[PDB]
Design a protein around this ligand. Structure first.
Ligand SMILES: *[C@@H]1O[C@H](CO)[C@@H](O[C@@H]2O[C@H](CO)[C@@H](O[C@@H]3O[C@H](CO)[C@@H](O)[C@H](O)[C@@H]3O)[C@H](O)[C@H]2NC(C)=O)[C@H](O)[C@H]1NC(C)=O
Lengths: 940, 207, 207
């Protein structure tokens, strides 16, 4: 009985049976069993071809909180009846399971399971209301690595027509094959479309498109809406490549975080805080999908649960009952919390799910285990599960008042009620939890009664209910005034020291418009900030209003004050404004800091005083209404701010109360020498110009303001000649050595050791021409105020003696020029023995485009020169080579007091004085040098 | 309870300043759901708070391990400073301390000898150019193979076999195509070890 | 609870086809409370009852080491067959199983070549004659030195080191005088290696 002549076996199964042929390819007795089983598998396959699959009857719409489950097909007694340890039947799942996630895991082609589904389990699931949805991996649907049917790149190219073919085939094979009731997509990066563990962009997009076409063929947007579109993944949504592209096509979204890590998230030391929290996930999905569309899965205790899978996320087997693999008490089960678990924000959940649904009733292994390898009753002993635990848990959830349907007793206005249902939902719990936008445009809405029920709503657009007449808290969402979350956690999470959660509730966005029939509007005592959302022109019938006790800046001239003036005018034109009909006072405006400051310079005289930098310079509180309060007197003018002739602010908010503080905000001073300070105190005893950076307590990188303190005369800013240096010959590694010249101070982690020698040297040219006046080198203490590197005890800067040596020769043979004979010592540092994080010294208008310095810790015994950062100081000065040459020529001639006469000497002295002034100036003016040089060449 | 393991940097990393030498103390032993781990690392007996606890690079489930890596200056490791990490966490009775340093002992200059391939090595597709480095203390040292002034990745080394003089020794063999070996472009064994001149040396080879 | 560790035979025995390798399962850290140990041997994963228990060896921690030795076929062992020790004790929830085998992979013959010191190397006082044995798989291998057919003891042989190509390599250096190593005298490095061709290799040496 050859395997090529079986007819009814799938080409895959045949390829398997012939690979099994190759092994023991000639063993006389095993070549029998392999053919005899390929045969019995062909008999099964043809029994699969001749069955009468049950026609799929219409299934009532899924409504209310649901309970779903992923049943290990390997754990089903009929998937492979040869495995006698599996005794349970997914058909034994109770009616409390609202959703049946068809899992196709470990079912042969000839497997009875398909028929049992089609003829028994699928019918029963229908008759009980359980809808069956098959799940496949993204690899199953995309990629070619074990992509099954998708391996046929000819049958399915990554092309539009190719994608259409792939979709039709996939739906036929996995959905239409059994006329299945739903489509579920595994999104686990493992299930992610993979090929050589490599992202297939065409695979990803094409799977997006093929699911999308199936969703054009099945699901809410599909030809066959009776088939569902589910999506469950272990990956966080922000990593779901199909989230964006499949949201519009999907019918269901499932997510299971089984285990303490999924309940509480994981822990990050870097931020020292929880990560991957439930709320994060539900929010992520909310970026894509509705909380009604969201269902969460927990895990039963699966047989033979190995490390990782052995989550014990539900109640475990009691330690005494060492042979009892079933333990049914949900009380205090983490799954109990799951059954109670609702997302704090957004809205009410779509429902619940279960991973390893085939394990309902089996207890989790006790922790006093996993040291034993060959012994596990609760984990690895086989039991026949009645799914009783699943029934109990599903019923417990099914008895949650939280899911109660929103009804007309909630919103009496059948128009308003229907409109809410249209825009919000049908569950009462939704209203307490609904955290979205609310567009109210049906003019038919005669009364807003029940609107008070909106507790978490994000935005609220009243966009044309002209039949409504009065507006107040009783008909205004609970979220109307500011507040904190009142939703207590039902999550038995692992947060223990993080045991505070007010969760300030942002006051809802209240857009109101087309309430033409509105007569009474009461927003007083809502602590509201602005009038935004209020279509004042639309409250045509407005007759009574009170907005006292808000957080709104009603100071005249504000856009807030503008709307207030309009409303006051409307009242003064309707019945006259008076203390009874209108209330706006008792505001407590919150000052915010201004975005920009204009004081870019603070000038003080040179005196032995000291000044609080921030106070003189870091100042100002602007309102969200744009009200800039910049002084105690400014706050006193706010006290003087009057509305209707009197203030609108609460009498209790003293300027102190009113004032926002710029304390804890830091400063970065920077004197003209590029020296830096951080004392808000600054002493004007020294004539200096400093540059001030304002840092928020929140940020010390982007300055909120820059300033120029000026004691005495202004000074030109220096320049980091070291920026853009060209590394030249030196002991220090030029690649690394540029880091000292790298402009940035650099991090503690970065290496600041020049050379393996108490003294180490580095040459380097400068980027561009300039006037050099100082230099500086950072000690490692700058990098870390506490460093073990000993400081440079003595150091030296020198230039290449280009006057005596051909700089062309040096550039030709830099190593040859490693001699101080090739150099000219220009400066020398020598530590006198005091701790310092850097050293600095002026420079007498130095000129060498190239330089070469050595530093020296002077530490003999394997103490190496380590220098934090290299600072070369001056101004930009083009033609520095030629200008400095002229300067030295002027020096030499001014020495040549015998060569030139007194009449020439006076002009030469004027010229030398000019050059002296020019040595440290910013605008290179070579003209005087040239005129003097012409005079000198004439005199020579 | 948890346990700590401190791993010195690669001898090349500690021997090339262009690299950033570091010892990594990681704790993977008995741990719990409580994830707080106040990793603490010292050097020469002075505990440094600063660190860069690696973001968990674990791809998926079942890897709850925290590792801290401390970069160290060469002149600090080299000076034999003893970095001891004492890690405290609530699951632990007290912080656990473990120390590593530059190995104690008189540094000993490696003696390098070049050996050409055995004839069988040219009968092999890959012939082996050998550098035997002996008499080197401490055992930490970096040797490498290059050809035609360019690095040769097909090189293998040996553990620092303690010399009879208390130093360590090894042989390294760079493998090259036996045709390449026959037309051997100039190879160089480049070694960074404090026991080296300029802590850096090249040994030449040519056809 | 006691602990079980299964050790293989000596490398030379498994590394010369003439010799008979055996796996001996010694259980250490065995407390007084649960002293009893039951041993099951296994050749190639097949349970065998030919293991022979030796008298116990008390450890320094007031614990005993109890060993049962089962002979294996040399070629079976070198071919990666699994020698398995099952240890039974009252302190274990279930019997402990341990398995061992030769390194998996196609065996690669060790090539053994002895080279005398480089002229620079022989310029020392005690020149070393080095026998490098490379290209050897599975890593299981054994090498020994001799000179003039007589064993040379002033020698240290490195353990086999898995090469980048999946075989193993090592060097053994026999120290003689640079007077003697370069005096002129034929050394023979004799290797018996499961990684060696015919479980053997030879390396010739001369000044
Ligand atoms: C890491 O975490 C996941 C999620 O908690 C663990 O659960 C699931 O384990 C099963 C059984 O090992 C995996 O099922 C198989 O996956 C392969 C992927 O090629 C698929 O082809 C088979 O049809 C089968 O479904 C499943 O991928 C895995 N993940 C999920 C979301 O169910 C997983 O076991 C953990 N890692 C290990 C090594 O156990």
């Amino acid at each position: 009985p050859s395997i090529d002549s079986l007819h009814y076996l799938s080409e895959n199964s045949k390829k398997e049976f012939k690979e099994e042929l190759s092994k023991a390819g000639q063993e006389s007795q095993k070549v029998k069993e392999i053919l005899a089983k390929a045969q019995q598998a062909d008999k099964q396959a043809q029994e699969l071809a001749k069955m009468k699959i049950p026609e799929k009857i219409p299934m009532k719409p899924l409504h209310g909180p649901l309970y779903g489950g992923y049943f290990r097909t390997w754990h089903d007694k009929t998937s492979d009846p040869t495995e006698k340890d599996k005794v349970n039947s997914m058909g034994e799942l109770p009616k409390e399971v609202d959703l049946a996630f068809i899992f196709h895991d470990w079912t042969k082609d000839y497997s009875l399971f398909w028929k049992e589904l089609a003829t028994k389990h699928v019918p029963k699931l229908n008759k009980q209301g359980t809808r069956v949805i098959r799940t496949i991996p993204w690899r199953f649907l995309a990629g070619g690595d074990n992509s099954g049917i998708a391996e046929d790149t000819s049958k399915y190219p990554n092309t539009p027509e190719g994608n259409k073919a792939l979709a039709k085939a996939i739906v036929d094979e996995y959905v239409y094959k059994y006329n299945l009731d739903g489509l579920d997509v595994d999104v686990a990066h493992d299930s992610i479309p993979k090929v050589d563990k490599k992202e297939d962009t065409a695979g990803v997009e094409r799977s997006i498109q093929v699911f999308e076409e199936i969703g054009k063929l099945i699901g809410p947007k599909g030809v066959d809406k009776s088939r569902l579109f589910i999506m469950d993944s272990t990956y966080m949504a922000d990593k779901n490549p199909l989230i964006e592209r499949g949201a519009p096509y999907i019918n269901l979204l499932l997510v299971q975080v089984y285990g303490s890590q999924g309940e509480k998230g994981g822990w990050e030391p870097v931020s020292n805080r929880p990560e991957k929290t439930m709320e994060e996930r539900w929010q992520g999905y909310s970026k894509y999908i509705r909380p009604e569309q969201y269902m969460i899965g927990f895990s039963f205790y699966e047989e033979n649960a190995q490390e990782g899978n052995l989550w014990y996320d539900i109640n475990s087997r009691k330690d005494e009952d060492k042979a009892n693999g079933i333990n049914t008490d949900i009380t205090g089960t983490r799954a109990e919390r799951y059954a109670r678990w609702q997302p704090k924000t957004g809205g009410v959940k779509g429902g619940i799910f279960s991973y390893a649904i085939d394990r309902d009733g089996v207890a989790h292994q006790p922790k006093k285990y996993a040291k034993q390898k060959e012994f596990k009753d609760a984990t690895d002993n086989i039991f026949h599960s009645d799914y009783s635990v699943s029934k109990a848990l599903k019923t417990v959830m099914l008895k949650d008042k939280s899911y109660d349907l929103i009804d007309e007793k909630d919103f009496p206005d059948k128009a308003l009620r229907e409109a809410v249902m249209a825009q919000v939902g049908t569950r009462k719990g939704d209203l307490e939890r609904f955290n979205g936008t609310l567009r109210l445009d049906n003019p038919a809405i005669q009364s807003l009664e029940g609107l008070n029920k909106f507790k978490k709503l994000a935005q609220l657009d009243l966009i044309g209910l002209s039949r409504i007449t009065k507006l107040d808290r009783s008909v205004l969402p609970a979220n109307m005034k500011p507040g904190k979350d009142t939703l207590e956690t039902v999550l038995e999470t692992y947060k223990k020291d993080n045991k505070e959660e007010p969760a300030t509730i942002p006051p809802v966005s209240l857009k109101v418009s087309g309430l033409t029939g509105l007569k009474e509007l009461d927003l007083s005592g809502f602590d509201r900030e602005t009038l935004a959302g209020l279509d004042a022109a639309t409250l045509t019938s407005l007759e009574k209003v009170d907005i006292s006790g808000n957080k709104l800046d009603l100071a005249p001239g504000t856009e807030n004050r503008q709307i207030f003036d309009t409303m006051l005018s409307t009242i003064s034109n309707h019945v006259g404004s008076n203390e009874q009909t209108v209330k706006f006072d008792k505001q407590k405006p919150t000052g915010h800091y201004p975005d920009t400051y204009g004081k870019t310079s603070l000038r003080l005289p040179v005196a032995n005083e000291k000044v609080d930098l921030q106070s003189q310079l870091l100042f100002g509180t602007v309102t969200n209404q744009g009200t800039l309060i910049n002084s105690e007197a400014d706050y006193k003018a706010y006290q003087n701010h009057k509305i209707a002739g009197r203030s609108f602010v609460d009498s209790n908010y003293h300027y102190n109360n009113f004032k926002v503080s710029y304390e804890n905000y830091t400063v970065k001073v920077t004197d003209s020498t590029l020296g830096t300070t951080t004392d808000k105190t600054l002493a004007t005893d020294k004539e200096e110009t400093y540059k001030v950076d304002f840092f928020s307590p929140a940020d010390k990188t982007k300055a909120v303001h820059t300033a120029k303190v000026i004691v005495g005369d202004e000074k030109t800013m220096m320049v980091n000649l070291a920026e853009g240096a060209t590394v030249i010959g030196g002991s220090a590694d030029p690649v690394n050595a540029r880091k000292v010249f790298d402009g940035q101070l650099g991090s503690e982690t970065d290496n600041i050791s020049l050379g393996w020698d108490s003294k180490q040297s580095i040459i380097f040219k400068l980027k561009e021409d300039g006037l050099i006046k100082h230099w500086r080198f950072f000690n490692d203490s700058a990098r870390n105020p506490e460093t073990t590197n000993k400081p440079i005890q003595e150091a030296s800067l020198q230039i290449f003696n280009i006057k005596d040596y051909n700089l062309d020769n040096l550039l030709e043979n830099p190593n040859k020029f490693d001699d101080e004979k090739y150099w000219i010592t220009v400066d020398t540092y020598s530590a006198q023995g005091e701790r310092a994080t850097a050293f600095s010294n002026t420079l007498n208008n130095i000129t060498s485009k190239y330089w070469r310095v050595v530093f020296d810790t002077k530490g003999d015994r394997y103490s190496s020169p380590v220098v934090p950062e290299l600072q070369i100081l001056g101004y930009p000065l083009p033609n520095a080579d030629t200008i400095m040459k002229t300067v030295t020529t002027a020096k030499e001639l001014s020495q040549q007091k015998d060569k030139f006469s007194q009449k020439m000497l006076d002009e030469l002295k004027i010229k030398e004085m000019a050059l002296e002034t020019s040595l440290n100036s910013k605008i290179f003016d070579v003209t005087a040098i040239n005129a003097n040089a012409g005079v000198l060449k004439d005199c020579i | 309870g948890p346990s700590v393991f401190l791993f010195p940097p690669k001898p090349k990393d500690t021997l090339m300043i262009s690299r950033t030498p570091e010892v990594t103390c990681v704790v993977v032993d008995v741990s719990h759901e409580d994830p707080e781990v106040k990793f603490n690392w010292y050097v020469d007996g002075v505990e440094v708070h600063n660190a860069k606890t690696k973001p968990r690079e674990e791809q998926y489930n079942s890897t709850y391990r925290v590792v801290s890596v401390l970069t160290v200056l060469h002149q600090d490791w080299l000076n034999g400073k003893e970095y001891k990490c004492k890690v405290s966490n609530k699951a632990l009775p007290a912080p656990i301390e473990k120390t590593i340093s530059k190995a104690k002992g008189q540094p000993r200059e490696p003696q390098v000898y070049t050996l050409p391939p055995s004839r069988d090595e040219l009968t092999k597709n890959q012939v082996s150019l050998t550098c035997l480095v002996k008499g080197f203390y401490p055992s930490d040292i970096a040797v490498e193979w290059e050809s035609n002034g360019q690095p040769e990745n097909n090189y293998k080394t040996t553990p620092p076999v303690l010399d009879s003089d208390g130093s360590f020794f090894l042989y390294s063999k760079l493998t090259v195509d036996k045709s390449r070996w026959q037309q051997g472009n100039v190879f160089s064994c480049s070694v960074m070890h404090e026991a080296l001149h300029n802590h850096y040396t090249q040994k030449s080879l040519s056809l």
